[PDB]
Amino acid sequence: VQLVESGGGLVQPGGSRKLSCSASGFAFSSFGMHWVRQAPEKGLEWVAYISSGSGTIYYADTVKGRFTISRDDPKNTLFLQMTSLRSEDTAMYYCVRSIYYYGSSPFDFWGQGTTLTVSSSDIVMTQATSSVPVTPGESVSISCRSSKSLLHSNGNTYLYWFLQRPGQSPQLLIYRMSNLASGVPDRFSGSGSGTAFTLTISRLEAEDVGVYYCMQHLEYPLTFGAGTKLEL
Amino acid sequence: CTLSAEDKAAVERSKMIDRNLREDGEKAAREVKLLLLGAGESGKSTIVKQMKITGIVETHFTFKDLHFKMFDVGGQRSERKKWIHCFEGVTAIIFCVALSDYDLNRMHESMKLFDSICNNKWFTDTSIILFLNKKDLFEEKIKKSPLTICYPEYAGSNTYEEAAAYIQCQFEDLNKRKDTKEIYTHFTCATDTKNVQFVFDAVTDVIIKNNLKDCGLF
Amino acid sequence: PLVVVLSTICLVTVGLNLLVLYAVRSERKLHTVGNLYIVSLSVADLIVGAVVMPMNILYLLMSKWSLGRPLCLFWLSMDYVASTASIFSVFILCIDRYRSVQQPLRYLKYRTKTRASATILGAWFLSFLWVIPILGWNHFRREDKCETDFYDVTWFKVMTAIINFYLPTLLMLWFYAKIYKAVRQHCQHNRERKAAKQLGFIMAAFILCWIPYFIFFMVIAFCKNCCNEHLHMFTIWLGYINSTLNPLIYPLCNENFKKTFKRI
Amino acid sequence: IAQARKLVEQLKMEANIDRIKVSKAAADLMAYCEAHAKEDPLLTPVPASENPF
Amino acid sequence: DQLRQEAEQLKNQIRDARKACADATLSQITNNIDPVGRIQMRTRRTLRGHLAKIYAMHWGTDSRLLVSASQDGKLIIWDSYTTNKVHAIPLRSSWVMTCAYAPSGNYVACGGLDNICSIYNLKTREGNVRVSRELAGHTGYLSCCRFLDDNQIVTSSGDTTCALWDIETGQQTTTFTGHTGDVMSLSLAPDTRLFVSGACDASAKLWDVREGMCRQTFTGHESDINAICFFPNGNAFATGSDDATCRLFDLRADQELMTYSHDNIICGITSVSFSKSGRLLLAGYDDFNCNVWDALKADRAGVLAGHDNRVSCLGVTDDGMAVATGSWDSFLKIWN
Ligand SMILES: NCCc1c[nH]cn1
């Protein structure tokens, strides 16, 4: 699987750009797509969604109606056309896939992201801290809080954990608060109930350092935690 | 009730699966499914070649805007016929028996086969296209002797067409009920596209007759 | 007494039609391209029996329209819409059967349920088109009698009658005669007995129920109000009995429909 | 000489059988069907709250 | 003849040894056990979307997912809870006659008339279901795929033989022969170290997956054996005849434990399954109705009257919460 986005660059305010996400290596038509973004050294923030078949579309309330998302399934090329960009739209825009059925990991693979720069109700997810120094071999516990109770009547606690190692793109770790992602070491484990949630990392390794994130998927819009950084 | 962002996305996926299943079924009903049968050493690699071109062997040939599917049976060895019912709804049963069938007794085996498919509850209302294709050896072995060698029913003169009529004449006696199904026998020279055209005609006549039974006329 | 009998008829119609529709919803073996037309026919006859007929029954009992001008116009428009829909549903069903028989393989290239629904909705749109005059004739009368604004316009009445019963009747006769020819040639190899009986029953019911009414249509268009009113209601009730009987001809001649009804 | 030899050899092993007879194995079915009678959602209908359907 | 006489006397005396120690019937002891009343089960779910006769169906190991195969040429994986179509797979040959679900849920196997068992992978990194393997080597139509692990599968066929296959290599690891007719159904034991297969020869047999040994043989029917299943404790198995009678045999007793037959039933059983407690024997019939028998007294404690056509496949979930039934009308029904 290889999602590579193109369209990043520097643009003056008031203009319009387009970001393409040329997919390769999976059944594009069967995957819904997102456009999670990240402002410089601040945290992640969802942008848009487009379901399979282009049936459903959702936008972030910050730019709802200002961005538009279109999916070209026979060609495997997803677009997000931004109409008017302010000084706050500058960010690294990621292209994320998501497949929804009973038992899927709907945030498994995250694109390589593209850099976009611009010259000068909703559930709130809070992370306790912003930096935690630790050394290898020490078990660590990270925790973030939510406004409502994510435990849906189904029983699924729609809480997602990511990890953005320095210079890389996020990588899913726990897609429903208790289920390990694909290809991640089995030392990670998530728990927690109600509003509070915690991620425990036993036998911490050198390469596990980075800014963790907690996201909720109980209801749109999708909201990200502030971001906990493990320091070494 | 309100649904989760995921539990809705699951429901949307099911609709897409449901749409494709329905759409695919429409294409299936546009084809003519002809079950192809034959007796031992009757000649089965010569009529299939004439068409526009292991267990079950399925063949495709689009002739005059009709997509024909022909399912051969020369791959299955178990003759228990626990799989015939899977061939309900076929638009015909192309049964191939030639005049040289008494070279390898043919009376018991051949008549027992046709009595089998005319007795099957599943096939009694489907037409049976009967094929007697070639004319290269059908005359040179009739004159060897009367048909008393293995056909005691007849002990009279044995010409080509007259005796051929007797085989057909005794054939319809095999058909226990001619009220619903119809045999479309063929006596031709396996030299050209004769075989393909006859099945096309025998396929139009069975389709058109099926429409009327739906209209309540025929 | 009369109303009682009429009521029975009315109720019967509705009941029967509903059953037919329910069948085409349940079996899933009836979800063919030759049953969407029967569904349209059943819907038209259900409208006739549910919205049109009962108000007419009330009109006979009270000898006057007690529901006022708006409901008068509503009832007249529903009557014309549902009657034209019934006739055109029968016509399109006949065209379906004829094109099936004369060109079986070719039609399969264009016998998609999409085309069947398109034709059904086109016929229903043509029927609904009847509301333009019934509600806007004056733009382009006793208060106790419900009637249209054109019931004494000769040319309009003649043209509507031609477009509603006579041309469909002639084309139906032609196509059912051709279907009978095909059936006979196929039977030639008792068999033709069933086909003749069914086609005769269909056309006899249709013509015996709908020809007197359009005769009255054109005559009172010509006469300019010299005719009786009791005659009118008799012909209209024949036309309603036509929709009552339609479920007893088209869907009862199909084995799957009969089995579905037997199960219920 | 060796066509039915394997067949009878299989029959020979069908003679040396750990014979647990019909009544010896009659109670085993009864014991199991009783010891798990409380876990069967169909034999004993489950309350409408714990039923996932 | 010498071996024939030895064979004839061996069986007669072996049966005599079985008869001599045969104490009493199951009913003679379980008569005092009270019945289960009427098991009136209502159709909670109706899974629709198949456009042809449904030939096979297998429950998921988590008691929530289903697989169904149709003559339509489709293999559909449902969510039994929300009646949602998780997967839809186009099979190479429309003539499907059996299917199985991997006990880990990763793969799904299906086969039929083309003598090939196609094994598909569900949890692919590319998001679609591909064909991991095409197990070929049988010389007849296939039936009753039954996964053992993610890399070991049994298959019955109309070649009068069953076969154990190492899916990774694709070579028949073992071949169990001895039948004299098409083998219609096999059902793995709970511990996955044995299995029992019934064949059109009106006889079934217990085979060992490890040594390829005809450990036991079982007779008593007068017609084919179109269905077979294991008692939940792996010590008995019930076969569904085309004779229109079901029979519960015990592996150890070398005899039929009991017969489930009723006069009104004139047609053969198409599929057989058990309840999690080993009490309700569910038999799908050709009468277009299933039938719930009390698996210890042989009484029809209720009926799953549904479908417009004959019932082909039954399944009871791992926890016993539901009963999925299929039939030639192309509708699956989940009863509870
Ligand atoms: N019963 C309404 C008769 C009609 C329809 N269209 C014209 N006349």
- Alpha-carbon distance of E38 to E294, in angstroms, equals 10
Please give the resolution of this entry in Å, rounded to 1 decimal: 3.2
The token duo for B14 is: 């099911």
Facing residue for A102 by CB, picked from E84, E126, E127: E84
Does the bond joining A221 to the residue before it have cis omega, within 30 degrees of 0?
A: yes
Q: Which residues pair with E203 in a beta bridge?
A: E199, E219
Phi, psi of E183 (to 5 degrees): -95, 120
- Residue C263 C-alpha, separation from nearest chain B C-alpha, in angstroms: 20
Determine the Cα–Cα distance for residues E54 and E58; give it in Å rounded to an integer.
Answer: 12
Residues 6 or more apart whose Cβ sits within 8 Å of residue C4: none
| Contact indicator for B95, B127 with CB cutoff of 8 Å | no
At how many degrees (to 10) do helices C167-187 and C191-223 cross? 170
Mutation to test the E interface, candidates A52, A102, A109, most E Cβ within 10 Å: A102
Contact E332, E312 (CB under 8 A): no
Q: Let me know if C11 is exposed, middle or buried by CB neighbors in 10 A (0-12, 13-18, 19+).
A: middle
Atom of ligand 1 nearest to the CA of C239: 1
Give the residue from E46, E40, E68, E66 showing the smallest Cα distance to E55.
E68
Burial E62-96 (b: 16+ CB within 10 A, else e): ebbbbbbbbbbbbbbbbbbbbbbbbbbbebebbbb
Dihedral sign (CA E61, E62, E63, E68) = negative
Compute and round to an integer the Cα radius of gyration of chain B: 22
d(CA E25, CA E261): 16
Structure-block tokens of residue C133: 């005059």
Tell me the C-alpha distance between A67 and C116, whole Å. Answer: 41
Q: Is the Cβ pair B16, A101 closer than 8 Å?
A: no
How far is the C-alpha of B17 from the C-alpha of E129, rounded, in Å?
Answer: 14
Structure tokens at C192: 């033709």
For residues A226 and A131, give the distance between their C-alpha atoms in angstroms, rounded to a whole number.
Answer: 11
Q: Which two tokens stand for residue E107?
A: 């793969």
Strands A210-216 and A228-231: antiparallel
Query: What separation in angstroms does the CA of B201 have from each of B36, B71, C46, C174, E211?
Result: 16, 19, 43, 26, 57
Ranges of beta strands (E only) in B106-182 are: 128-132
Backbone torsions φ then ψ of A103, nearest 5 degrees: 115, 5
Tokens 């599917």 appear where?
Answer: B69
B185 and B164 Cβ atoms separated by less than 8 Å:
no
Residue C264 CA to residue C255 CA, distance in Å, equals 15
How many whole angstroms separate alpha carbon C151 and alpha carbon C221?
6
Q: How far off is chain B from C200, nearest CA to CA, in Å?
A: 11
Full strand arrangement of the beta sheet holding E74-79 = E54-59, E65-70, E74-79, E84-90
CB atoms < 10 A from the CB of A96, how many?
26
Instruction: State the sign of the Cα–Cα–Cα–Cα dihedral E78, E79, E84, E89.
Output: negative
Ligand 1 pocket, residue C45 CB under 6 Å: no
Give A110's DSSP letter.
B
Distance CA(E77)–CA(C140), nearest Å, equals: 62
The answer to the question of whether B44 is labelled as a binding residue is: yes
In residues, how long is chain C? 264
Q: Which of E82, E84, E128 sits opposite A30 (nearest CB)?
A: E128
3 state DSSP class of A201: strand
- Residue C91 in contact with ligand 1 by CB distance below 6 A: no
Q: So what's the architecture of A125-229 in CATH?
A: Sandwich (2.60)
Number of structural domains in chain E: 1
Yes or no: domain B3-218 corresponds to CATH 3.40.50.300? yes
Residue C4 burial by Cβ neighbours in a 10 Å radius (0-12, 13-18, 19+): exposed
Distance C83 CA to ligand 1 centre (A): 5
* DSSP state for residue E113 in the 8-state scheme: T
Is the CB of residue D48 less than 8 Å away from at least one CB of chain E?
A: no
Mark B54-87 as b/e (b = at least 16 C-beta within 10 Å).
ebbbeeebebeebebbbbbbeebebebebbeebb
Residue at C221: amino acid letter: A
Sequence-distant (6+) residues with CB within 8 A of E331 are: E46, E47, E48, E50, E54, E307
Determine the structural domain holding residue C197 and report its residue range: 2-263
Q: Which CATH number fits domain A3-118: 2.60.40.10, 3.20.20.70, 3.40.50.700, 3.30.110.30?
A: 2.60.40.10
Among the listed residues A204, A166, A160, the one whose alpha carbon sits nearest the alpha carbon of residue A185? A204
Using a CB-CB cut-off of 8 Å, the residues of chain B touching E113 are 55-56, 76, 83, 86
> Which residues on adjacent β-strands are paired with residue E208?
E213
Q: What CA–CA distance (Å, rounded) separates B71 from B90?
A: 10
Can you tell me the distance from the alpha carbon of E136 to that of E172, in angstroms, rounded to the nearest whole number?
9
Neighbours of C48 (CB within 10 A): 28
Could you tell me if residue D37 is left (phi over 0), alpha (psi between -120 and 50 degrees) or otherwise beta? alpha
Give the domain ranges of chain A: 3-118, 125-229
Per domain, the residue ranges of chain B are 3-218
CA–CA separation, E222 and E201 (whole Å): 9
B127-158: b (≥16 Cβ within 10 Å) or e: bbbbbbbbeeebeeebeeeebeeebeeeeeeb
3-state SS, A126-175, equals EECCCCEECCCCCCEEEEEEECCCCECCCCCECEEEEEECCCCCCCCCEC
Which residues are E43's β-sheet partners? E335
Interior/surface letters B102-123, b for 16+ CB within 10 angstroms, e for the rest: eeeebeeebeebbeebbebeeb
Residues 6+ apart with CB under 8 A from D45: none
Strand partners, A50: A33, A57
Angle between helices C255-263 and C2-26 (to 10 degrees): 100
As a whole number of angstroms, the distance between CA E176 and CA E216 comes to 12
Among B4, B10, B12, beta carbon nearest to A218: B4
- In the reported structure, the alpha carbon of residue C239 is separated from the centroid of ligand 1 by a whole-number distance in angstroms of 8
Chain position carrying tokens 């396996």: B190
Please state, in angstroms and rounded to a whole number, the distance separating the CA atoms of residues A173 and A36. Answer: 17
Q: Do chains D and A touch (3 or more CB pairs under 8 A)?
A: no
Name the strands in the sheet holding E171-177, side by side, starting at the edge strand that comes first in the sequence.
E142-149, E152-157, E161-166, E171-177
Q: H-helix or E-strand containing B113?
A: helix B107-119
d(CA B5, CA B20): 23
- In chain A, the N- to C-terminal Cα span, in Å, equals 31
Q: CB E21 to CB D42 under 8 A?
A: no
Q: How many CB atoms lie within 10 A of CB E263?
A: 6
Q: Which residue in chain E has the smallest CA separation from D17?
A: E252
Residues shown for chain B:
218
CATH of residue C153: 1.20.1070.10
Report residue C190 CA to chain centroid gap: 31
Is there a contact between A220 and B5 if contact means CB atoms under 8 Å apart? Answer: yes
Which residues are CB-contacts of A176 (< 8 A; sequence separation ≥ 6)? A156, A157, A158, A159, A160
Q: How far is CA C225 from the centre of its chain?
A: 27
What is the DSSP-derived secondary structure letter of residue D47?
P
Question: Cα–Cα distance between E328 and E260 in angstroms, integer?
Answer: 24
Confirm if B44 and B57 have CB atoms less than 8 A apart.
no
Tokens 């019937």 locate to E25
Max distance between CA atoms of chain A, in angstroms, equals 51
Q: What is the 3-state secondary structure (H, E, C) of chain C?
A: CHHHHHHHHHHHHHHHHHHHHHHHHHCCCCCCCCCHHHHHHHHHHHHHHHHHHHHHHHHHHHCCCCCHHHHHHHHHHHHHHHHHHHHHHHHHHHHHHHHHHHCHHHHHCCCCHHHHHHHHHHHHHHHHCCHHHHHHCCCCCCCCCCCCCCCCCHHHHHHHHHHHHHHHHHHHHHHHHHHHHHHHHHHCCCHHHHHHHHHHHHHHHHHHHHHHHHHHHHHHHHHCCCCCHHHHHHHHHHHHHHHHHHHHCCCCCCHHHHHHHHHC
Task: Provide the Cα torsion C87, C90, C92, C95; round to 10°.
Answer: -130
- The residue type of C185 is Q
Q: Is the CB of C239 under 6 A from ligand 1?
A: yes
Cα of E142 to ligand 1 centre, how many Å?
63
Please name the residues in contact with A154: beta carbons below 8 A apart, sequence gap of 6 or more. B4, B7
Q: How far apart are CA C195 and CA C191, in angstroms?
A: 7
Instruction: Provide the CA B157 distance to its chain's centre, in angstroms.
Output: 32
CB E110 within 8 A of CB E124: no
Q: What is the CATH number of the domain that holds E268?
A: 2.130.10.10
CA-to-CA distance for E81 and A30, rounded, in angstroms? Answer: 22
Structure tokens at B74: 């020369």
Hey, what's the torsion of the CAs at B158, B160, B165, B171, to 10 degrees?
A: 80
DSSP string covering E147-208, please?
Answer: EEETTEEEEEETTSEEEEEETTTTEEEEEEE--SS-EEEEEE-TTSS-EEEEETTTEEEEEE
B84: distance to nearest CA of chain C, Å? 22
C245 closest CA partner among C204, C199, C194, C205 = C205
Separation CA C118–CA C100 (nearest Å)? 17
Q: How was this structure determined?
A: cryo-EM
**Pairing verdict, β A32-34 and A37-39:** unpaired
CB contact under 8 A, D26 and E233: no
DSSP of E211-280:
TTEEEEEEE--SS-EEEEEE-TTSSEEEEEESSS-EEEEETTTTEEEEEE--TT--S-EEEEE--TTS-E
Query: What residues pair up with E229 in beta bridges, in sequence order?
Result: E238
Give the separation between CA E52 and CA B28, rounded to whole angstroms.
11
